[PDB]
Amino acid sequence: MEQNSYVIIDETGIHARPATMLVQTASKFDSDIQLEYNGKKVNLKSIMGVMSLGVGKDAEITIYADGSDESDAIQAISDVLSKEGLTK
């Protein structure tokens, strides 16, 4: 299983807007990607979780992936994350 950590830079804190794309692009692949935040792991396939993940700004989040696209899913995430600008 391959994961990926990041830092929130969006004062909006990963919301349903992005959480959607991330979650989407996450499962959209196949691998079993999971969201994490300050030891708070969840399902990167559900918003209710990514949303209730209080992905506040200045907060460091993470995402896991265990499949055949895991790495590919991780590459998509960071992309979606940076794509929106919730991180870096």
UniProtKB/Swiss-Prot annotation:
Domain HPr: 1-88
Protein name from the UniProt record: Phosphocarrier protein HPr
Family stated for the protein in its record: Belongs to the HPr family.
One GO process term, biological-process aspect: phosphoenolpyruvate-dependent sugar phosphotransferase system
A single GO cellular-component term on record: cytoplasm
Gene3D superfamilies: HPr-like
Species lineage: Bacteria, Bacillati, Bacillota, Bacilli, Bacillales
CDD domains attached to this UniProt entry: PTS-HPr_like (cd00367)
Active site positions: 15
Pfam families assigned: PTS-HPr (PF00381)
Residues in the signal sequence: none
Taxonomic superkingdom: Bacteria
Documented activity regulation: Phosphorylation on Ser-46 inhibits the phosphoryl transfer from enzyme I to HPr.
Functional description taken from the UniProt entry: General (non sugar-specific) component of the phosphoenolpyruvate-dependent sugar phosphotransferase system (sugar PTS). This major carbohydrate active-transport system catalyzes the phosphorylation of incoming sugar substrates concomitantly with their translocation across the cell membrane. The phosphoryl group from phosphoenolpyruvate (PEP) is transferred to the phosphoryl carrier protein HPr by enzyme I. Phospho-HPr then transfers it to the PTS EIIA domain. P-Ser-HPr interacts with the catabolite control protein A (CcpA), forming a complex that binds to DNA at the catabolite response elements cre, operator sites preceding a large number of catabolite-regulated genes. Thus, P-Ser-HPr is a corepressor in carbon catabolite repression (CCR), a mechanism that allows bacteria to coordinate and optimize the utilization of available carbon sources. P-Ser-HPr also plays a role in inducer exclusion, in which it probably interacts with several non-PTS permeases and inhibits their transport activity.
Key words, A-Z: Cytoplasm, Phosphoprotein, Phosphotransferase system, Sugar transport, Transcription, Transcription regulation, Transport
Modified residues (Phosphoserine): 46
Cellular compartments annotated: Cytoplasm
Natural source organism: Staphylococcus aureus
